Design a protein around this ligand. Structure first.
Ligand SMILES: [Zn+2]
Ligand SMILES: [Zn+2]
Ligand SMILES: [Zn+2]
Lengths: 144, 250, 151, 121, 81, 77
RNA sequence: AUCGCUUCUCGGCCUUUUGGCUAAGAUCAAGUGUAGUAUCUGUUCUUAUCAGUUUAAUAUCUGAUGUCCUCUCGAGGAC
């Protein structure tokens, strides 16, 4: 029965995810986690998308509690919003120059993969084939 | 040094920009990445969402928000309407005036049920006037200072406001059509945009808005800008199915 | 490209400023980088329309848009169809207005016969403004301005 | 000491100068061989004026696609293939939109109207 | 620290201090499914103990309905040994 | 870092995960194998392919499980 | 010198200002475990390349800082 007050509460969480403090963003993230697990399956996915926009920047963080509540928010948000949306958030930073960003994105993508590794089969991008390998999946584009 | 030979593999940003099929993406540090052809194909895929700004920065996430002063959170309308805020303001002022001794006296002899606010006011706010806030669709991460600009990308000319009309000298309301703004005056006088122009001004390069008036006093359309041979400044300054949804609730 | 927003109105917000920039043409920059103390508008701003002729005609258009040692100037053949704030902004392009334009209108009706007087900042300000608008294009009855008489 | 300015116009202290890394200079050929200290400074310059001018006079608009391409031969070959692609994905009715004459054989829009209004079709 | 050596058919139990919370989610509500542990963390002096306190097995460790919605309950004996 | 003992135990636990250095080859080959295991599991994409080519379900799954061995070219170096 | 106005300075009032009494009326005043985050506070950094380590890039780290005469690290020169 959060499908009712999700709208009332969003502009307060976006308010507190635009900084106020570490603990401010740690706590707004916990709230996002539990909203997502409650509203699983009732269509209030536009609101959780909106709040993804604000939670995902905290991904580069260091404090244990803060980054941990962030990761929790992203597992909740993974079941509630689906694994396409989150694989798309996780696409570009898998192969980044840096190593702090490579490592956080591979941490996330690992947890997105463990749970729901089987949806992703229809969510992976199209990755062209160079000379001595084959990389396209022709299985999937047989016409019929 | 082996990292240094791969560093000689560390191609030019022009190397990249010319190789790649979609050159918008290519950025600064892209090249020190172990697999830039991938990285760039990824960053040029559809619908994907780029890394935040602030991994480079030395300042942490919103320590840059540190400086300013900020105004308290603003409730939803349908919750103000039910008039909670005034109850709470009143109780606040009461208990800030009252003194310690009286505080404990009220602890031991409570003012039971000082106030009331009935239900169906609440239950109708939350179940009858609750409404969709403004949400942002997939991708638009919030970064520092983003709210610093309220809204944009209405390059359209017809976009006018009522306070805009008032504090510019033009009319608000049903007369926002029949009111050519003070900028359409010099639109008619010396023109629109030299290399932009894809905007037509109403009453100056467009026809009369509904029931407009030709004349040279305050409140009209004046001379629709035309050549000496009769062709207007541009355009025409004078002027010469079943969309029902299938599954929808009663 | 770069245009001087003169008589830059205080509360006339840079947001609607840029919306008018777009409603005229290439809204690329609307900026009035103000006093480091005040925050309000600083009387002259930079409006960049990334096309030169765009900014030129946008300027010709958004001019006249309605955004004591004798520094008072008499201004006649007066346009009766103006408002207070718009007239003050137009007069103030060459200086401050220490008295908004007092229009010598008849009292029987409330409609003017075509004269006024305006306290500007400087006598050279009244000079320059009355010069650029000597006989020049007023709203309906062309302007005629100079140093004002004393009553 | 070449110490960069602060708001209050003094030297910037040394650990701070090292942080900001002013030592590193970027040869922007588009900007009259202008050369920049400060990396984000360099980057914003790509939309700053001097780069804008550079572009205009190069004969190529200041669209993002070339930002961070600073050498002019690279720029022109880049914008060359870009031009080719824009002309490709344009639908041009002249060469695409095609017309049969009455005689059971086909031409394009252009040639159809050409021989049409020069007195046969 | 986790046992995680894979699951079985032996129920787990709770001391009375630990009475009521889920094993990981640390909830207090709406428990849906029973907990199972491994033989190795099942045997001997570890028969009927508190997966958390180590106290005596009296009440039944359960699984918060969130943990079952996300199937974090399909990994096996989560005993902090 | 005992977390890491457990975490490269997790890498040892779930074939297809990653770490910050993972190569385009391991990534795309793992996704390719998973694609095959699911074309086999789901009883209906099998009909889709069986019918798309003119093969028969034994033929289909035999191809698939042969391909499962080097699906995306030969290895990286 | 006198009159008036203004400016500053100084003196004088400044009781116009310490509710009465007793046994000074009497008496007296007692808390965490763990870590860790953040914030203050205190402090510390021009030196000249180059090689490497390193890093998204910096940085860090490591390592030395043209010969000959000669006069006082410094100087004029054959070079
Ligand atoms: Zn649990
Ligand atoms: Zn065990
Ligand atoms: Zn217990």
């Amino acid at each position: 029965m959060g499908k009712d007050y999700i709208y009332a509460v969003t502009p307060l969480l976006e308010d507190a995810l635009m900084d106020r403090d570490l603990v401010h963003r740690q706590t707004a993230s916990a709230v996002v986690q539990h909203m997502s697990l409650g509203v699983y399956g009732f269509g209030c996915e536009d609101s959780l998308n909106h709040l993804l926009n604000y939670v995902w920047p905290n991904v580069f963080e260091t404090s244990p509690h803060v980054i941990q509540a962030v990761m929790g928010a992203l597992e909740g948000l993974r079941v509630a919003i689906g694994p396409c949306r989150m694989l798309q958030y996780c696409l570009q930073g898998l192969f980044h120059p840096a190593r702090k960003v490579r490592d956080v994105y591979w941490k996330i993508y690992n947890s997105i993969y463990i749970g729901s590794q089987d949806a992703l089969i229809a969510h992976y991008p199209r990755i062209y084939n160079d000379d001595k390998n084959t990389y396209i999946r022709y299985e999937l584009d047989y016409i019929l | 040094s082996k990292k240094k030979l791969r560093r000689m593999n560390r191609f030019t940003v022009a190397e990249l920009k010319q190789l790649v099929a979609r050159p918008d993406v290519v950025e600064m540090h892209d090249v020190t990445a172990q697999d830039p052809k991938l990285l760039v194909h990824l960053k040029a895929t559809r619908n994907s969402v780029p890394v935040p700004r602030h991994w480079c920065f030395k300042r942490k996430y919103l320590q840059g928000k540190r400086g300013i002063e900020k105004p308290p959170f603003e409730l939803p309308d349908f919750i103000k309407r039910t008039g909670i805020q005034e109850m709470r303001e009143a109780l606040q002022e009461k208990e800030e005036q009252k003194t310690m001794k009286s505080k404990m006296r009220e602890k031991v002899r409570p003012k039971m049920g000082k106030i009331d606010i009935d239900y169906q006011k609440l239950h109708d706010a939350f179940f009858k006037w609750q409404t969709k806030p403004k949400l942002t669709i997939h991708g638009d991460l919030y970064y520092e200072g983003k709210e610093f600009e309220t809204r944009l990308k209405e390059k359209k000319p017809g976009d006018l406001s009522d306070e805009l009309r008032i504090s510019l000298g033009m009319p608000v309301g049903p007369n926002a059509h029949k009111v050519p703004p003070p900028w359409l005056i010099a639109m008619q006088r010396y023109g629109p945009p030299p290399s932009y122009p894809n905007l037509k001004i109403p009453g100056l390069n467009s026809p009369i808005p509904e029931s407009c008036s030709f004349g040279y006093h305050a409140g009209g359309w004046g001379k629709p800008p035309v050549d000496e041979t009769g062709k207007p400044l541009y355009g025409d300054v004078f002027g010469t199915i079943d969309r029902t949804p299938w599954g929808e609730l009663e | 490209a770069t245009v001087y927003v003169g008589g830059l109105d205080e509360k006339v917000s840079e947001p609607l400023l840029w919306e008018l920039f777009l409603q005229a043409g290439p809204v690329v920059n609307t900026h009035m980088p103000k006093d480091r103390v005040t925050g309000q508008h600083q009387g002259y701003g930079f409006v960049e329309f990334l096309s030169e002729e765009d900014a030129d005609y946008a300027i010709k258009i958004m001019n006249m848009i309605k955004l004591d040692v004798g520094a008072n100037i008499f201004i006649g053949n007066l346009d009766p169809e103006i408002d207070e704030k718009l007239l003050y902004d137009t007069f103030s392009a060459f200086g401050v207005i220490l008295q908004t334009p007092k229009i010598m209108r008849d009292p029987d009706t409330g409609n003017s016969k075509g004269y006024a007087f305006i306290n500007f900042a400087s006598f050279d300000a009244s000079d320059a403004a009355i010069e650029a608008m000597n006989g020049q294009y007023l709203c309906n009855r062309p302007i005629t301005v100079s140093y004002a008489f004393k009553k | 000491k070449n110490l960069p300015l602060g708001w209050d116009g003094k030297p910037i202290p040394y650990w701070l100068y090292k942080l900001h890394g002013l030592n590193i200079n970027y040869n922007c050929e588009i900007c009259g061989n202008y050369t920049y200290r400060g990396p984000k400074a360099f980057q914003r310059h790509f939309a700053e004026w001097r780069h804008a001018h550079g572009m205009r006079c190069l004969g190529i608009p200041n669209t993002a696609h070339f930002a961070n391409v600073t050498q002019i031969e690279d720029a022109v070959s880049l914008w060359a293939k870009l031009k080719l692609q824009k002309a490709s994905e344009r639908w041009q009715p002249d060469t695409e939109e095609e017309y049969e004459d009455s005689s059971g054989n086909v031409v394009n829009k252009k040639t159809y109207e050409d021989l049409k209004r020069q007195g046969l079709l | 620290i986790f046992c995680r050596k894979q699951a079985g058919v032996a129920i787990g139990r709770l001391c009375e201090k630990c009475d009521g919370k889920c094993v990981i989610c640390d909830s207090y509500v709406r428990p849906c499914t029973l907990v199972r542990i491994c033989d190795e963390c099942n045997y001997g002096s570890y028969q009927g103990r508190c997966v958390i306190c180590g106290g005596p097995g009296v009440s039944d460790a359960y699984y918060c309905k969130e943990c079952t919605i996300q199937e974090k309950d399909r990994d096996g004996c989560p005993k902090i040994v | 870092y005992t977390i890491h003992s457990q975490l490269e135990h997790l890498q040892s636990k779930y074939i297809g995960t990653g770490h910050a250095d993972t190569t385009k080859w391991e990534w795309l080959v793992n996704q390719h194998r998973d694609s095959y295991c699911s074309y086999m599991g789901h009883f209906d994409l099998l009909n889709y392919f069986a019918i798309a080519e003119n093969e028969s379900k034994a033929r289909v799954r035999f191809n698939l499980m042969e391909k499962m061995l080097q699906p995306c070219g030969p290895p990286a170096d």
